Ligand binder design. Sequence first.
Ligand SMILES: Cc1c[nH]c(=O)[nH]c1=O
Ligand SMILES: Cc1c[nH]c(=O)[nH]c1=O
Lengths: 446, 446
Amino acid sequence: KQLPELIRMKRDGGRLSEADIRGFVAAVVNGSAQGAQIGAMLMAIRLRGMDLEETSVLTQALAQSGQQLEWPEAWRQQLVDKHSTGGVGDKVSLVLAPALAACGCKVPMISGRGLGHTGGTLDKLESIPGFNVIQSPEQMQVLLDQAGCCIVGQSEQLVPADGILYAARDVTATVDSLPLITASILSKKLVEGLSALVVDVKFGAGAVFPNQEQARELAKTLVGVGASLGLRVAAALTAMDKPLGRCVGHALEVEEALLCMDGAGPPDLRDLVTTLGGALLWLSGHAGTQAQGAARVAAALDDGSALGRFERMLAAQGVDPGLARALCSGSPAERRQLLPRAREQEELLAPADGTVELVRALPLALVLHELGAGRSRAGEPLRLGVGAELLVDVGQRLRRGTPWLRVHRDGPALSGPQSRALQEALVLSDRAPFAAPLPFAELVLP
Amino acid sequence: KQLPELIRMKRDGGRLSEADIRGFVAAVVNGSAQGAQIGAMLMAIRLRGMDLEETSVLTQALAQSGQQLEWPEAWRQQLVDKHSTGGVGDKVSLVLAPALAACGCKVPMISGRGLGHTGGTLDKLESIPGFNVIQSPEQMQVLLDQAGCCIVGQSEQLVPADGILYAARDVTATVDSLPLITASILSKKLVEGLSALVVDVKFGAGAVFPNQEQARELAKTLVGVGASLGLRVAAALTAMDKPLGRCVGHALEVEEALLCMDGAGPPDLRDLVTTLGGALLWLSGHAGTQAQGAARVAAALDDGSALGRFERMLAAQGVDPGLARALCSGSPAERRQLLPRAREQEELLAPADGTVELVRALPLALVLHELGAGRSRAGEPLRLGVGAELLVDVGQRLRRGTPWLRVHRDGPALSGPQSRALQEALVLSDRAPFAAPLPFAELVLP
Ligand SMILES: Cc1c[nH]c(=O)[nH]c1=O
Ligand SMILES: Cc1c[nH]c(=O)[nH]c1=O
């Protein structure tokens, strides 16, 4: 079947055969599938869905569209990874990859760019001058040899079909598809040759699933399809009454990740890194319990070894050694200097007295997207200095006129609608001040 | 709003504002809308639909995406056109444009290429060496001055937004959309500045919507939106289960068109040319009744004047004068020599005794599409010599082993599936032989 008939089948709510799916994926890889045919297929899938068998075949076809990664036998047990479905201000991966390398693991992370109103690890890393996200299978061997970790993107050799579709999904309103997400995440992790995978599936607005049960179905699908494809997968269901940490953006999130690797940073960020890291170390058999693993990851954050591994990864992936060292050993203020900065800053002030009940992630994601932190079309460059910093904690009592959000923007102003959208993100109440709740994190186990 | 937001709105079954539609159309024209975004919007519209107001605004936006055609005042009443929704083997337009010119009309026809499994007039004309379908607004003045007619394609000056979307729709299973068809047809006809339009909508196997109710609704929509936009439109709903005439393809359909302008050819082809031409002459006030108009058109087919006008149109649009003359004044055998020929021919024979009840148009269209008469991707060149000739009439009694279909192919030989698909197109029965019924033709008015 040529492309037009395959689209028509799915458009009508028909099931696509193994041959059909593999044919479409082949056409995507070789360029036969034109843009409009990719967008129409994606939308057909988004509106008409796929059953488990279709989803499973799509995952295999995307994985097999490039090369499978092979590693020394001695590494087989050390190979672990973590993936997120997406979360606003989630920079766990920047910290967790080098922290796990410091715990004697190997992390061959194939990651992703932005997707809808959620930022991607690859875009965050590109705020570091010279960082190269495109790395060959053999170069990835060297990186894992040098730093014990790497964070790379899809390319012509690695899951090229996911790269194409992901880039198109971002900008065509086809991100929030269960079969597409499953195939996208799992294809990348399948080619990595892992002993264990943890996938962090978050819910609550901002997220791909504003609802716990919805997200639960995705978590169970990821684990079920994962297992049927030979991979040891666990999911973590996570929720928050705020963005993760204080920084949303790209350069800003690198900065906060560096804070965490200093043994500092916000507690929620550290809690999630240690929780997910420890889950992984337990899952791969490197820790007796999740709690033992979490303490092991925490220790790596505290003794400079995670930071050390991160510096090695940066230099190994194209960052100038002098800059990588200057960035990692530098103070917060020196780091700000080395990374892209937005030309302008403004602070939003608290309209009244109140306890911060919540900082809504979604309105913040949407406004930052429009300011250059997201894409309206594929391949569009980002403004990596753009972002926002939360200046208050959830549960904190604050006075009126106290700054709660600093926005970093390249233009002269927030538009009225975006100024208003950001103001409505701040939820205040009469309640007594309380400790910032640590992220919800329930495991879905193999 | 930006495109992913526009696509998302339509994806969710939401209504797009006038501003939204115009923004999307603008983005298509200037290149801002990438292929994938065009495909996703088209599939969203295909699956979720548009209301009459949306459809009307989309028609206006496509019309206004290029130049409006202006003509001498003296031509205002002479300006007429006919458009089809599609029909396998429908070459009425190749004949009717010059025939109407011969009846003292002006026909500034903006037409189209192939669309799904149905061939387009512009691809048929391109089997004539040197024929240029791209003609500027001022060049069109010259053509109408020289031949009284022209057949041109969408370009950067003429309905560019339709050209883009039409080319995508062809290959993304988004052809059979009521709002997309209405907006596509009417936008082209609106810019021509016509005094009267006839749109030929078919139902039955040969049609875009074989279901009669779908076709009637499309006819009423075209007329209703047309009228509301200032255009005098009529529709002809014609049932047709078999291809029109005997030839399906491109070079082959030019050849059969030339037979009709010879005063010859098959009765169904001539009947439809005279029926639709006379409807038009009546509608524009050039004939007292449809029957008086049809006799007028028939006379132009009989005295060589339609053929004369067609030769002028060919030469004016780039065809070498010596070739145009040699083609028009030439015998059927000489014409075959001048136009592309497939390398190979094979005939399918009658499996038994029987009266031909029917030759199913759809299986024929689908097989010829696969042999190079159609596109699996936009901008793909066609094999213009490929096609098929019906060697029998419907209603004709035939013996077993008598050739009923001649297939002109460039590749190796018909496969098992396509050979079988063509054989099932021939419907035979025990009935007494009967006269080939002439096209059903019901006229829809505002
Ligand atoms: C939602 C999502 C997150 N991460 C991925 O790699 N793919 C996806 O589709
Ligand atoms: C079906 C169809 C026929 N002709 C056109 O110009 N557009 C269409 O969408």
